[PDB]
Design a protein around this ligand. Structure first.
Ligand SMILES: Nc1ncnc2c1ncn2[C@@H]1O[C@H](COP(=O)(O)OP(=O)(O)O)[C@@H](O)[C@H]1O
Ligand SMILES: Nc1ncnc2c1ncn2[C@@H]1O[C@H](COP(=O)(O)OP(=O)(O)O)[C@@H](O)[C@H]1O
Ligand SMILES: Nc1ncnc2c1ncn2[C@@H]1O[C@H](COP(=O)(O)OP(=O)(O)O)[C@@H](O)[C@H]1O
Ligand SMILES: Nc1ncnc2c1ncn2[C@@H]1O[C@H](COP(=O)(O)OP(=O)(O)O)[C@@H](O)[C@H]1O
Lengths: 512, 208, 523, 529, 73
């Protein structure tokens, strides 16, 4: 029914801790697999933290919050999501100070929020900039995802695709340097070819099919037209259908259907275009004028998809076709091609311009290999987004965790009060990240984690992390495990903000 | 540590569940390895009986009760699609690999350490296979030894000479001048009213 | 039906499997032993309604009485109890230090074993920290006894030991025990608690008590003699009653006159028996049981001082001082087994006449504290404070070194040991740091028993020590959770009390950690 | 008795309604105060609305019990009447029932309890009214700066609260207007808070007028206007159309030429009619034609295009311009002379980082201003806008109300001593009820102390001691009107700290809570059908 | 729940273990089939009281007729 008292906070901890214990071993390159018993007796042997929790049923609402916060991470950053839940579960797993010591959550939350400002400052100290102009460094950075994948045979290809693609979308002139991979980097697959044939189209590719053969097959100077209205007979304000029974009234309603569709098409062809792109559908009578005009018929193109076209070829959006002025012409466009590349038509309006958007062409030998190349390239685009938004990397392999933990432990010495105890407990929670990397490799956890903390005390904290493959210690200057800063800061805030959230819950109430 | 209407195996006993399934599937298929091996029956329930030693048929067509063992059955399907042979020996090696690993895992050894040894043993074992292979020319005397070695594992040592000469000649008719080969060129017909040893070739084609 | 119990092959004893953490179970038996005495720690210690084996009700807060009445059957707890018994040797205080500190070492050891640290490495850290604590404890010595034999000095330092046994009345008891202890310290190199005895008498209250020399006995002199300086003291265990002959001695009486004749013959014999006491040059006689009416007048006839000691421990107390041993016969004139004393007289103190054995001719190194109280249970609890109070200064006859109390040393010694573990690389730092946190359990005990948030006491005690304000302890107060200086308040502990307590507590904890399985046996 | 339902009587029915109301209080007890803890709300579908506001919880709280529904109906009475204090009502009413239920076990009839609680509420309102402070201390004094300072200290703005607090108090008084018989209230629509990258937070300036985030465009126009006429036209001077959903069907090519030439021509009358009115500070919502912008250059008018609707809505209310949606009066065309013209004194476009913000000065009657949060980055400017917006309403609620009272348990602590002494004067089976009414009020400072992570037993005792000393004698050595500070965990004088609340809240909350406990105490039976 | 079933892993089909001698069970089924027809051998063969699927009573000593009505499973 409901929960109240200390049972709530201790219950939310066991729920969040239980969800993290599932994916404790799903961290690093030597991640362990998980067996998911389907209801029909089947098994899925995935090792992805997002896919595991997505398929698991959870009864506690605290678990739904942990999972729903992880999904929000995937939309922004396709990496480090597993670290959020583990840290959020370890930060909450310290229930000694929470209940056994009878401290109020406001005392704990004030310490967790104080450490978060210190964890953020320490990560910027151990950071390091990157020369984004040199693509060789970004290759080593993007290899964190290409490693242990089938696309390693064309690893450099994936970097040049993702690197150059995000640079086109990056509109730095607006100050904030916003990037939109979902809209301005729309990806579409093309059957045929191989992995090497994968490239980036410098334009906008529409997957519209060819309905008739009377369409422009190859053009050197396209002329694209844009409009939102539909090419059909003007209906009434309501959706009332036209019901007719008298034959004499048919020719009247038919003539009204033909003339208005006729006059609207006559104005579209006055500019001598090569393709009519409309947002809404195009009826059969309207297509009879497009095939007669020897121009391509295109429809069902969204607003943002049309906005990129006007920036590419120089077209102009109009409400209706009747108001089409001479400005709506795609002069300077590269070419218009509706070739059937791999048993599927593809509209290419590429040009020699970068209209703050592009389209990625995924060539491949089969749908299985195409999907493998697809999901592997999206993460590379996001790593390029995170580095280009904030070109600062921090040492990975558990080094940034141990480096930050030493700063809090040394800073807690001057922390007079009861908040020093949970403030230090957050530092010991960061050690769980190398604790799992060492557990997966099989090396002794206590022996290496003890020596690992000693290296950060004496030697510089910017290096001396952990090697997940070998298990021994290694400097991140010698091993390119450097991860972005924006991923770690958002990973650290989301873990503390999530733990602060569940700690603020004291009564699970039902009602609507 | 679990939600209602569900279950979770936290400790290492979850690994023992998978080792026990492979050990059981090993003991099932080991009796049908080679020519002298026994046969297994496939009762469809409707009333159709079927005897065969092909491990791909004893895993693909036979539904397996244990959830973990059904995964290995899907691999035997994949194994049969590439080479068409070795599905039975694949399961026996998997059963013994996991068996030997449990001896060391019980002593406190992590699984990830053992798997790294398999990757090293594979490369050494893969390099040694290059030295043992015989790259001689394929003649009718050699393919008969291959066909006999492959057919004796599926028949009663009576249809050996019957199907051997037919299986070999069917291939030689569809390859010359180093041309790529395709088994779809050979049609497989079935007819009743004759003994099992009445198998023979048809240079042309049969129509219904 | 299989699978049955794992690792169970020795008499079916409860052998905890690898998942059940057999080591974790022996620790839980020791933690429960601490909770039974963690609350009795300090001046605000909570009393325990102890039910004796004789179905007697006693309310006390002494640790030695709690464990002596609590039948501790778990062997893992017996080791810590044996350390408490070993704590009583070489010092008469710090018993709960062994229970509270060792319970924290084992309780904190579970946090290490749960991580995966080996039990053999945990032991090496505690042994290293115990050796390091013994090097830091001399540096914490704030003051030292002047050894001036001053009651103002002895009473001032004695207040700390008297408190936590009988709180509130620490002024009277400190002055009385000081008067008793100062009178023997001139006997250089021979001070012992056996000399300073205790005699409880039912009276008004604790304020009506005083100190008197010699072996005092509450039972007044039954005879009519006021004083006698006779050395020969004849002690008899058999009471003055109708004689019985060890041989046959068949006594047949038929008529009433014969009853009177035999009755007269017994009185004439008893008159000869008491006559024999004076014939052996002994004008003093002791009796365990009842005393007859005719024999009482015979004691006054020859002026023989009659003495009555009903308690057995009172009789044995004299057998080892004067030498007079108790014989089984009733008045055998055995002059060889009699005692020797310089003076024996009666004295009235607090409106009660008490027998005294004073040493006038001899130098004298024996005393007695005559306690007054309206309840036997109250005087017994005050007697336990005398032992823990007198034994505090039996230790000061050794090297006179005092350290601050009130949890002050426990934070500084923890602060000094924690720094040693932070700079010491390796795995031993984990157990060394937890050895410092074990010391924090003692201030946490004082704070919890005083009604104060313990975490606030540790936070303040560490801040003042961070600024170098040593000798700062917990201010015992219900409405003031702050701290104060233990030196200015006069609260001081003994050096050897903390030295032998930290040593025996670590050995008891290490001895329990070294054990991993309890196994039964048979001879 | 045989019936088509069920019945249940006795004292246990009172206890069942007591434990029910006590349960509803515990759902909103820990969430009391500004440091209240959040709480989940699992709906029937599965959504989880997380919040700490007590009013939002009770609106969504669904407990199928009659006694609980009485407190839910009670919540609507307090929200509509005042709009605050609903959480304290349910908590106060729950303790009065838990205490009254104990009296009923001591053979005290509920009618004697109902009579005691009614007299206690009457005397409590009397003691409250006798110990108020009228709305004052605006200028020359401070119970204000300390009010806004303590409200904004939670955010990063608390580095220098005095600098930002002065900008709130000076502007909160600047927006004053009687407007009804000496009412003066203050508007919910408050001083516009813009921002800029002024290299530091200290550079934020307080403006005595509205600030708009637009520019005139062409540099030929002036940037320093003094004309009082302010135009406000929502009809766009650009190419007008029938409707977005109505395309003018055109067939002949020649008809399309004169439509282009006439539309370019008709604006020459629209621009001459607008310029003839003399309005220099012109504002246009739907954009302005390029050629029309050139006409303002020669005329020297300060025209602005693409002005936001809501920002322009406040300018019409400032200068008093009639917002016109179309020039045509259903037959012709006109600018409605002396209708859309405002009244001002000066308008100058000052130089601000990255956006030249126009400043309007001394309108007809605006009661508004603007503040430009000059800071380092957007994270600070976005946070200070929230802190000032919160602190703005903190001082607004005080100066809007005619009388206030010290909050933080000061009223509940003071009444605990007065009503306890008043109980000894009446007697007649009402001394215990008025005494329990006194003890019940202490739950508010006892609950606020638990939520603040402090010992409630000590702080509640410290409040009653400072308040009891005020009753023993009126000497100044005895502290008076001492409240409860949640952060420092110590009592504090709310008159200096600025922790004030309206008088109607503490008055209505005690009245409504008393009426609720009376409504439940009268229930001695339940009949189900 | 452990311990599991010996060799029973395929659609719950009873896989008689090595001690259970799975080959012996098939021999017993074929052994029982002979005992029904062993007595119908020769001129002195014992007739069978067969009940047809249509609840018809037929008495015969033919072996093929027995197996037709005796639904061997
Ligand atoms: N080659 C490597 N060597 C050492 N550590 C690595 C290596 N690759 C990844 N890691 C570590 O593993 C952690 C998880 O990486 P990743 O799998 O990319 O994210 P997630 O586990 O959230 O999916 C990172 O914090 C990183 O420090
Ligand atoms: N004369 C023969 N002698 C010895 N071993 C044989 C002979 N013929 C086949 N085998 C063995 O039988 C095994 C199984 O053969 P086959 O049935 O073709 O594969 P699978 O059993 O995997 O389907 C092979 O590993 C092979 O070594
Ligand atoms: N007035 C006081 N203030 C603070 N601490 C005190 C005070 N009196 C005694 N203590 C503490 O009580 C503790 C226990 O004393 P005691 O009972 O003699 O030993 P134990 O508890 O081992 O039997 C000592 O460590 C001492 O510091
Ligand atoms: N700044 C403050 N300092 C101390 N106490 C406050 C402060 N603001 C509000 N409170 C306390 O919080 C309680 C609840 O306030 P509010 O949320 O406005 O009403 P409700 O909780 O009924 O919705 C009040 O009784 C008041 O005493």
């Amino acid at each position: 029914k409901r929960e109240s008292g200390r049972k709530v906070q201790s219950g939310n901890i066991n729920a969040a801790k239980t969800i993290a214990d599932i994916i404790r071993t799903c961290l690093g390159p030597k991640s362990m697999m998980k067996m998911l018993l389907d209801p029909m007796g089947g098994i899925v042997m995935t090792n992805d933290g997002n896919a595991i929790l997505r398929e698991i049923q959870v009864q506690h609402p605290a678990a739904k919050s942990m999972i729903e916060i992880s999904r929000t991470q995937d939309e922004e950053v396709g990496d480090g999501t597993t670290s959020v839940i583990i840290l959020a579960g370890e930060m909450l797993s310290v229930a000694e100070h929470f209940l056994e010591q009878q401290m109020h959550p406001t005392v704990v939350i004030s310490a967790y929020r104080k450490a978060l400002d210190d964890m953020i400052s320490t990560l910027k100290k151990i950071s390091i900039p990157v020369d984004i102009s040199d693509s060789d460094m970004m290759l080593n950075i993007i290899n964190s995802s290409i490693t242990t994948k089938a696309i390693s045979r064309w690893s450099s290809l994936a970097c040049n695709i993702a690197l150059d693609a995000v640079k086109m979308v990056q509109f730095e002139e607006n100050g904030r340097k916003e990037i939109d991979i979902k809209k301005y980097a729309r990806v579409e697959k093309i059957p045929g070819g191989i992995i090497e044939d994968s490239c980036v189209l410098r334009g906008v590719m529409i997957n519209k099919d060819v309905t008739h053969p009377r369409m422009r097959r190859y053009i050197k100077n396209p002329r694209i037209v844009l409009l939102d209205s539909s090419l059909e007979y003007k209906k009434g304000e309501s959706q009332t259908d036209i019901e007719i029974t008298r034959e004499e009234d048919f020719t009247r309603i038919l003539q009204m259907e033909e003339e208005y569709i006729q006059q609207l098409c006559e104005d579209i062809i006055q500019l001598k275009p090569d393709v009519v792109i409309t947002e809404k559908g195009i009826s059969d009578l309207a297509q009879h004028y497009l095939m007669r005009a020897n121009i391509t018929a295109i429809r069902r193109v969204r607003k943002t998809d049309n906005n990129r076209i006007a920036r590419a070829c120089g077209a102009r959006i109009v409400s209706r076709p009747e108001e089409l002025r001479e400005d709506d012409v795609g002069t300077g466009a590269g070419l218009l091609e509706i070739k059937k590349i791999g048993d599927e038509y593809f509209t290419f309006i590429t040009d020699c311009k970068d209209p703050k958007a592009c389209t990625i062409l995924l060539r491949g030998a089969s749908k299985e290999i195409l999907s493998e190349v697809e999901r592997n390239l999206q993460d590379a685009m996001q790593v390029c987004r995170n580095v280009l938004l904030d070109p600062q990397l921090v040492p990975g392999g558990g080094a940034s965790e141990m480096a930050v933990a030493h700063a809090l432990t040394e800073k807690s010495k001057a922390m007079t009060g009861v908040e020093q105890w949970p403030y230090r407990a957050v530092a010991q929670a960061l050690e769980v990240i190398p604790r799992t990397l060492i557990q997966n490799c099989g090396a002794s956890t206590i022996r290496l984690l003890t020596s690992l903390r000693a290296k950060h005390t004496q030697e510089n904290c910017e290096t001396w992390g952990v090697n997940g493959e070998t298990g021994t210690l290694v400097d991140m200057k010698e091993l390119g495990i450097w991860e972005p800063l924006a991923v770690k800061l958002q990973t650290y805030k989301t873990a503390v903000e999530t733990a602060v959230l569940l700690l603020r819950i004291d009564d699970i109430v039902s009602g609507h | 540590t679990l939600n209602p209407k569900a279950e979770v195996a936290r400790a290492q006993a979850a690994l023992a569940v998978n080792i026990s399934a492979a050990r059981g599937l090993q003991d099932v298929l080991r009796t049908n390895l080679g020519p002298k091996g026994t046969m297994k029956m496939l009762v469809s329930g409707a009333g159709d009986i079927k005897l065969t030693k092909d491990g791909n048929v004893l895993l693909h067509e036979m539904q397996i009760q244990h959830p973990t063992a059904s995964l290995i059955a899907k691999v035997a399907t994949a194994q049969d699609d590439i080479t068409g042979d070795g599905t039975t020996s694949n399961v026996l090696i998997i059963g013994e690999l996991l068996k030997q690993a449990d001896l060391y895992i019980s002593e406190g050894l992590h699984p990830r350490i053992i798997t790294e040894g398999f990757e090293a043993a594979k490369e050494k074992a893969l390099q040694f296979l290059e030295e043992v292979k015989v790259s001689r020319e394929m003649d009718r005397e050699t393919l008969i030894d291959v066909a006999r070695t492959s057919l004796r594992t599926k028949v009663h040592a009576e249809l050996a000479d019957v199907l051997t000469e037919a299986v070999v000649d069917s291939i030689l008719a569809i390859k010359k001048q180093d041309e790529p080969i395709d088994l779809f060129m050979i049609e497989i017909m079935e007819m009743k009213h004759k003994s099992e040893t009445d198998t023979s070739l048809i240079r042309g084609l049969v129509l219904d | 039906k299989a699978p049955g119990f794992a690792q169970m092959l020795k008499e079916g004893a409860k052998h905890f499997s690898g998942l059940e953490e057999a080591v974790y179970r022996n620790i839980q038996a020791c933690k429960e032993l601490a909770q039974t005495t963690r609350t009795a720690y300090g001046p605000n210690g909570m009393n325990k309604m102890v039910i004796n084996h004789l179905e007697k009700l006693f309310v006390t807060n002494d640790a030695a009485t709690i464990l002596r009445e609590l039948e501790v059957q778990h062997p893992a707890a017996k080791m810590i109890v044996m350390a408490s018994h070993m704590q009583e040797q070489e010092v008469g205080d710090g018993t709960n230090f062994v229970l509270v500190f060792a319970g924290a070492l084992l309780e904190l050891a579970e946090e290490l074993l749960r991580i995966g640290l080996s039990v053999s490495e945990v032991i090496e850290g505690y042994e290293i920290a115990c050796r390091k604590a013994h090097e830091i404890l001399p540096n914490l010595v704030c003051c030292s006894a002047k050894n001036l034999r001053d009651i103002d000095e002895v009473s001032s330092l004695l207040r700390t030991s008297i408190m936590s046994k009988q709180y509130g009345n620490e002024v009277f008891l400190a002055k009385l025990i000081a008067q008793a202890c100062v009178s023997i310290f001139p006997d250089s190199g021979h001070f012992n608690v056996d000399n300073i005895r205790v005699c409880k008498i039912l009276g008004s209250g604790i304020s009506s008590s005083s100190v008197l020399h010699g072996m005092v006995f509450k039972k007044e002199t039954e005879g009519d003699v006021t004083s006698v300086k006779d050395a020969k003291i004849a002690v008899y265990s058999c009471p003055f009653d109708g004689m019985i002959t060890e041989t046959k001695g068949t006594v047949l009486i038929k008529t009433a006159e014969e009853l009177m004749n035999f009755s007269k013959g017994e009185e004439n014999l008893m008159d000869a028996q008491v006559k024999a006491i004076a014939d052996t040059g002994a004008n003093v006689v002791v009796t365990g049981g009842k005393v007859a009416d005719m024999a009482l007048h015979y004691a006054n006839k020859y002026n023989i001082m009659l003495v009555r000691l009903n308690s057995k421990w009172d009789l044995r107390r004299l057998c080892k001082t004067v030498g007079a041993t108790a014989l089984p016969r009733l008045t055998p004139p055995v002059l060889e087994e009699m005692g020797h004393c310089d003076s024996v007289y009666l004295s009235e103190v607090g409106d009660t006449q008490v027998v005294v054995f004073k040493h006038e001719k001899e130098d004298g190194a024996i005393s007695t504290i005559v306690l007054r109280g309206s309840t036997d249970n109250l005087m017994d609890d005050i007697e336990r404070a005398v032992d823990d109070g007198v034994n505090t200064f039996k230790v000061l006859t050794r090297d006179k070194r005092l350290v601050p109390g009130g949890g002050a040393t426990e934070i500084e010694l923890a602060k000094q040991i924690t720094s040693y573990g932070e700079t010491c690389p390796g795995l031993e730092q984990y157990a060394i740091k937890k050895f410092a946190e074990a010391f924090e359990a003692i201030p946490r005990a004082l704070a919890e028993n005083s009604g104060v948030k313990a975490n606030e006491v540790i936070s303040k005690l560490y801040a003042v020590h961070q600024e170098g304000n040593k000798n700062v302890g917990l201010d015992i107060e219900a409405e003031v959770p702050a701290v104060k200086d233990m030196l200015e308040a006069g609260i001081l502990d003994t050096y050897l009390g903390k030295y032998w307590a930290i040593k025996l507590a670590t050995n008891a904890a290490v001895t329990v950690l070294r054990v991993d399985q309890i196994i039964m046996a048979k001879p | 008795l045989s019936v088509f339902g069920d019945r249940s009587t006795g004292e246990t029915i009172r206890s069942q309604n007591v434990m029910a109301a006590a349960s509803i209080a515990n759902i909103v007890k820990s969430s009391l105060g500004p440091v209240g803890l959040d709480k989940m709300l699992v709906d029937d579908i599965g959504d989880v609305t997380i919040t700490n506001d007590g009013a939002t919880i009770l609106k969504l709280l669904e407990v199928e019990h009659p006694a609980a529904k009485v407190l839910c109906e009670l919540a609507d009475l307090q929200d509509k009447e005042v709009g605050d204090g609903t959480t304290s009502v349910v908590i106060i009413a729950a303790e009065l029932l838990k205490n009254a239920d104990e009296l009923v076990k001591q053979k005290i009839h509920p009618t004697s309890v109902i009579s005691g609680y009614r007299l206690a509420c009457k005397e409590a309102v009397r003691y409250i009214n006798e110990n108020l402070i009228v709305n004052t201390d605006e200028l020359g004094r401070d119970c204000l700066i300390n009010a806004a300072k303590t409200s904004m200290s939670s955010k990063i703005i608390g580095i220098n609260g005095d600098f930002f607090a002065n900008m709130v108090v000076d502007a909160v008084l600047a927006i004053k207007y009687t407007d009804i018989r000496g009412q003066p209230r203050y508007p919910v629509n408050s001083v516009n808070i813009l921002k800029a990258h002024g290299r530091s937070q200290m550079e934020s300036m307080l403006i005595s007028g509205y600030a708009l985030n637009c520019v005139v465009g062409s540099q030929g126009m002036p940037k320093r206007i003094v004309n009082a006429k302010i135009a406000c036209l929502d009809f766009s001077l650009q190419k007008t159309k029938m409707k977005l959903g109505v395309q003018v069907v055109i067939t002949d090519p020649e008809k399309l030429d004169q439509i282009r030439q006439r539309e370019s021509d008709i604006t020459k009358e629209r621009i001459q009619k607008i310029l003839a009115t003399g309005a220099n500070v012109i504002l246009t919502t739907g954009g302005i034609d390029d050629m029309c912008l050139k006409y303002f250059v020669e005329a020297g008018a300060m025209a602005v295009r693409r002005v936001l609707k809501r920002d322009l809505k406040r300018i019409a209310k400032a200068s008093g311009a009639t917002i016109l949606s179309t020039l045509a009066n259903l037959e012709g065309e006109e600018t409605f002379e002396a209708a859309m013209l405002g009244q001002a004194e000066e308008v100058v476009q000052e130089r601000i980082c990255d956006d030249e913000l126009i400043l309007i000065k001394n309108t007809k009657a605006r009661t508004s201003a603007s503040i430009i949060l000059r800071g380092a980055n957007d994270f600070m400017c976005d946070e200070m806008e929230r802190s000032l917006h919160d602190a703005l309403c903190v001082v607004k609620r005080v100066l809007e109300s005619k009388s206030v009272v010290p909050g933080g348990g000061a009223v509940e602590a003071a009444l605990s001593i007065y009503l306890e002494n008043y109980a000894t004067s009446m007697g007649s089976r009402e001394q215990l009820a008025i005494a329990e009414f006194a003890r019940s009020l202490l739950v508010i400072p006892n609950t606020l102390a638990v939520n603040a992570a402090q010992d409630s037993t000590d702080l509640v005792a410290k409040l009653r001691a400072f308040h009891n000393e005020a009753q023993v004698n009126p000497e100044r050595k005895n502290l008076k009107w001492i409240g409860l500070d949640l952060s420092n965990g110590k009592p504090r004088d709310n008159k200096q700290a600025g922790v004030f609340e309206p008088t109607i809240v503490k008055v209505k909350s005690l009245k409504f809570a008393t009426e609720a406990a009376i409504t439940i105490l009268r229930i001695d039976d339940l009949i189900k059908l």
